[model samples]
Target: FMVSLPRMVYPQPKVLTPCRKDVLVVTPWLAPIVWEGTFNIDILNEQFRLQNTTIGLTVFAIKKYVAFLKLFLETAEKHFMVGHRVHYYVFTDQPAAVPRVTLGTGRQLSVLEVERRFLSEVDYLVCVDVDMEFRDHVGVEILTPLFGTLHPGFYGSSREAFTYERRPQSQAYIPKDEGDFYYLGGFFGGSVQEVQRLTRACHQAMMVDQANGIEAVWHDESHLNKYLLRHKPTKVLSPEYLWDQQLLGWPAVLRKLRFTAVP
Candidate 1:
């Protein structure tokens, strides 16, 4: 017989104030922008918590980029999926150079000197740039089987103007007339199975581009856009998931800046 669950109390939710009714809260495809009131993190967290979800954060920092690890890992501890089982797969050439930041309970870290072997051992993989910090809570609300973050530079731009690899010869090329939001390769992820498929496809496309002596304008990011166009992500995160506050200061529409690049 199943026993009754323990009773727990939660603080009442704040007033549902529409911070930006003038702007689009979701992608045309219906992915959440992950703003403050758009989602109640409290409710979302409990759903995942009951499932015993595990989130794997993947990052590759080579050479001088390793210096950013301290802030990246530290801030994540404070704001990123705080109560979940998180395993950080930090892939770096210099294992000895990896930081020794203190992680919260139920979280673990491992320095993978090599990638490809263990990219998907968790429920979901959150691939992000190493040169960023968590400015606010980034948790289960953003988690989906497959998702991509809108590139801050092009979120407001028209599809015709998106900087996709315009050349027809390149495997990552997208015609000037057809497109969707430009996704930043620095931050995109999915379930283990789907993330594995994405990585493999991008790698293969890059190989074909190399064979033809063609490189997309944005490199791997170009291939990423191509893949998403044909196989749309289940959800698309708003620029709030990835932004540059220094380059583009906080706008009145943006209630909170969750993750951003360091200037």
Candidate 2:
């Protein structure tokens, strides 16, 4: 027989708080710079879960990047979309080498040689670099129709000062007068439709550059910046989402280092 439990009601804790009264939690363009205290993930998680959100994660482990997957996937299991259904798409040259890391129920991994159509299955997709690990919580607060992480190297710089491709011949060129933020190519994503649009546009721009015998300074990264400049991201993730504690040390502004670059 089931035992009767005493009825009681409890209040939810407030996880989201204002870190600074002077500084804005979101950018002027309305993209959130996801930080530890900036959001109450409990609330955010509840909202997404209510909607039955399904997330698709894409990572490329090419060449030597394969070495980073074991730790990457493991840490991700702990911090990424913790309570949601997730489909991981791993693109690798060596498929057999993909790690056999176990996943929780409702989560699955699909190994692919290259990414093709993805919109039919999931609501959102998160594309990240293979050579990184999660140090803390990175959850639904960063999700949006389209989102890009601010490059940790240049997040604090002015628009004109961003290191964009300066050459006029290349399609990725962005003169000093223009730029919203220096987005890291290593991490970016959105709804499958938008991600497909972004990736397809970048590919087309790259082909145009190649046909003209010109290449952007930072290759695909440069093309990505150009694309984002024309079409801004719905959310701009803070440097915390893409950090290298070794390169910059921990700053007071960053309360947590969520996902960071690994050597």
Candidate 3:
């Protein structure tokens, strides 16, 4: 699934990612983003400032599980800090405590507010669930270059790790094509400008549809996927990028699966 952050921008230079690197070192799961100084903890902050990549996240109600939320987002932040600029946009009914970057405009904001204010500045926008815990791959090594491409695709993979219901009547309503692949709304990225546009358009369409006694099969997800089909996401991440730690040994045996340890 995707996690969105507060939208903003910084100056940038062109860079690309390679599939494998000189060292396959595994420490703190920091292999995704590709930059020279990321390996040096001392220079990490400097690197992040230069890249200018920001993170957008949504924080819902505070609950007992907030610690996990902090840990997970921290992992992403750590990666971003390795050499990318990231700012988190969290929306919650009650104000919560988050370190480093936070947008405290208001609590539990509507789609309209997010669109009008935050979405304008960022380079890419990714939206996901509050329950998600981001693990590995933050910068270009893991994420960039997929934006707007056709093969690896847009909207990432379609394993359906999170089962969600979609409104059956809307364009997303799928009584006929029940098994067709619709993207995971939790995780997907696009140009900040593109995502901002899509977010607003989806909000507009959803409002109109909701008034007509209809809504997407999936609350915001269905509309988001439909929007992707028409507009097309620039980059598409692989399913492995979304491996579920909870599944562990069960899915492997049940599905007769095999794995190659990253190390």
Q: Model 2, range 49-132, lDDT digits (tens) per residue? A: 877888999999998888898999999999888899899999999898898998987888999974445767788999999899
Question: In candidate 1, what are the lDDT values of residues 48-149, reduced to their tens digit?
Answer: 888788999989999999999999999999999999999998999999999899999999998988544454457889999999999998889878878888
At residue 221, what lDDT does model 3 achieve? 73
Clash count, candidate 2: 0
lDDT of 3 at 135: 48
Q: Clashing pairs in model 2? A: none
Model 3 residue runs over 4 Å out of place are 1-67, 97-121, 141-168, 173-180, 248-263
The C-alpha RMSD in Å for every predicted model, in order, reads 3.2, 5.0, 11.2
Write down the lDDT of every candidate, Cα atoms only: 0.86, 0.86, 0.45
Which has the higher TM-score value, candidate number 2 or candidate number 3? Answer: 2
The digit string of per-residue lDDT tens for model 3 on 100-123 reads: 333232212222111545555555
Going through the candidates in the order shown, the clash numbers are 0, 0, 28
- Clash count for candidate 3 is 28
Worst 10 residues of 2 by lDDT: 1-10
